[PDB]
Each structure stands twice: as structure tokens, then as C-alpha cells.
Structure 1
Amino acid sequence: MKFNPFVTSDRSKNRKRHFNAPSHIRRKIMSSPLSKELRQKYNVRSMPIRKDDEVQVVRGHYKGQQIGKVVQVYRKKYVIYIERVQREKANGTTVHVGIHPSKVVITRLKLDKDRKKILERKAKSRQVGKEKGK
């Protein structure tokens, strides 16, 4: 259950809050998980996906093992486009098929100073949870 009386559980209110969420919040929503190799190393479940993190699609038609680079994130549409995840139109021109971050998995992050620090935060607050539970 939830217990906090300033939170919702309220189909409509959640949905509005999701659909009318703004971009910096949609960063958090369009997060995707880290493959088990990384998960071990960084001690992090998941990371807000980004422009050029390599990625395996897990569910859908394009479902495979083929580690594509994300091309671009379309936070308007809650969806990412991925290197080779694409389909021909009628006139031949290719088109990136929108994939939803949650059905994907990060296989190589695009580490910069900021991202590194985030993963350092998540590890830290994880291990504090583990130390509290012990």
C-alpha cells in the first residue's frame, strides 16, 4: 500500500501527471535498466537513457542481441530511436521505429562528469540501504 496522504493512486491524476509531465521529469520517466554486467559493476539498477548510450532491445519485433547506439530521444513522444531499429516506408526512405526506454537495456553508458557522479550517488544510497538493513 501507500500511506503518505499527499500522493495519489488516482488513474486520472497519475495519467495527467505522466502525459503532461515536463521534459526534465520525463528524463526520469524514460529511464531504462542497465544490463547485468554493468549492474554488477556500478551497483545501480537503472539510468535515465541518453542520446548515445548503446542499447539492446528486449521486447517487440526488434527484440534482439544487436547492441545499437541510441540515436535520439524524443521526450515529447516518450520514445527512443536506435541505430538500426528502423523500417522502410512505402517510398523506400528509412524511418526509426520508436522504442520505449523501459523495453530496452543499456549495455554501454555515455559517461561524462555528471553521469559518473549520478551513478556514484545511486551506489552510495544503495549501500546505505544495505548497511541499514544489516
Structure 2
Amino acid sequence: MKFNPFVTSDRSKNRKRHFNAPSHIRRKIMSSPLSKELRQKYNVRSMPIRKDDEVQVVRGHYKGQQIGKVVQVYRKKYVIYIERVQREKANGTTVHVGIHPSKVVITRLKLDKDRKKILERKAKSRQVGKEKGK
């Protein structure tokens, strides 16, 4: 149950803060879970997805053992595009059909200098949760 008297619980106002989100808050709500292998090597649960992570789709019309990298992150439509899952148009032109990153499992991260520190910050705070158990 929510106890804080300074955070909402109403349907109209969490939706309004969802679709009118700032574009740096919006990379946080477009987070995706790490794979079972890769959450054990880093002891972290989930990550915000960036442009060049290898990924497979875990639910939808297009799913099942399809590692392949994302190629475009529409934050405006809350949608990542992945380089293999595609769709022919009526024209014969082929386009990327887009999916939501919660329906998606990262299988290989792209590390830079900053995505080391985002991992280590989310990892070091998880021993502190285990250190509460006295």
C-alpha cells in the first residue's frame, strides 16, 4: 500500500505524467530486463535500453530466440526498433515494426564509461538491501 501523502494514486494523473514525460524521465520508464545469465554476472535486475544493445523479443507476434540489436529508440512513441524484426508495406518497401521495451530481454549490453557507473550504482545499492537483514 502507498503511505506517502506526497505521491499520487489516481488514474488521470499518473497517465498525464506518463504521456507528458520529460525526455530524460522517459528513458527511465523505457527500461528493459536483463537476461538470466546477464543479471547474474552484474547482480542487477533491469536497465534502460540504449541504441546499440543486443536484444531478443520475449512476447508478441515476433518472438523467440532472435538476438539482434536495437537500431533506433523512439522515446516519443515509447518504442525501440530492432534491426531484424521488420514488415513489408503495401508498396513493397520494408519498415521496422516497433515494440515496447518491457516486451524485450537484453542479452548483451553496450558498455561505455557511463554504463559502467550506472551498473555499479545499481549493484552497490543491492548489498545494502541485503545488509538490512540482521
How high is the TM-score relative to the length of structure 2? 0.98
Task: Look up the SS of the partner of 1:124 in the other structure.
Answer: helix
Q: Residue 22 of structure 1 aligns with which residue?
A: 22
Quick one: distance in 2 between partners of 1:85 and 1:9? Answer: 37
Q: Residue 90 of structure 2 aligns with which residue?
A: 90
Whether 1:32 aligns to 2:32 is yes
Q: How many residue pairs end up in the alignment?
A: 134
Q: Could you tell me how far 1:133 is from its partner in structure 2?
A: 2.0
Task: Look up the SS of the partner of 1:64 in the other structure.
Answer: coil
Quick one: distance in 1 between partners of 2:34 and 2:40? Answer: 9
- Structure 1: 4+ residue segments shifted above 3 A: none
Task: Look up the SS of the partner of 1:23 in the other structure.
Answer: coil
Gaps of 5+ in 2: none
Quick one: distance in 1 between partners of 2:56 and 2:127? Answer: 28
Gaps of 5+ in 1: none
Q: Could you tell me how far 1:60 is from its partner in structure 2?
A: 0.4
Q: Could you tell me how far 1:84 is from its partner in structure 2?
A: 0.5
* Residues 26-78 of structure 1, C-alpha deviations (whole Å, 9 max, x = no match): 11000000001110010110000010100010110001111010001000000
Q: Residue 60 of structure 1 aligns with which residue?
A: 60
How high is the TM-score relative to the length of structure 1? 0.98
Higher helix share: 1
* Residues 81-128 of structure 1, C-alpha deviations (whole Å, 9 max, x = no match): 001111000111111111100000100001001011110001100111
Quick one: distance in 2 between partners of 1:70 and 1:88? Answer: 19
Percent identity for Structure 1 against Structure 2: 100
Quick one: distance in 2 between partners of 1:5 and 1:94? Answer: 50
Q: Could you tell me how far 1:8 is from its partner in structure 2?
A: 0.5
Quick one: distance in 2 between partners of 1:117 and 1:96? Answer: 32
Q: Could you tell me how far 1:132 is from its partner in structure 2?
A: 1.1
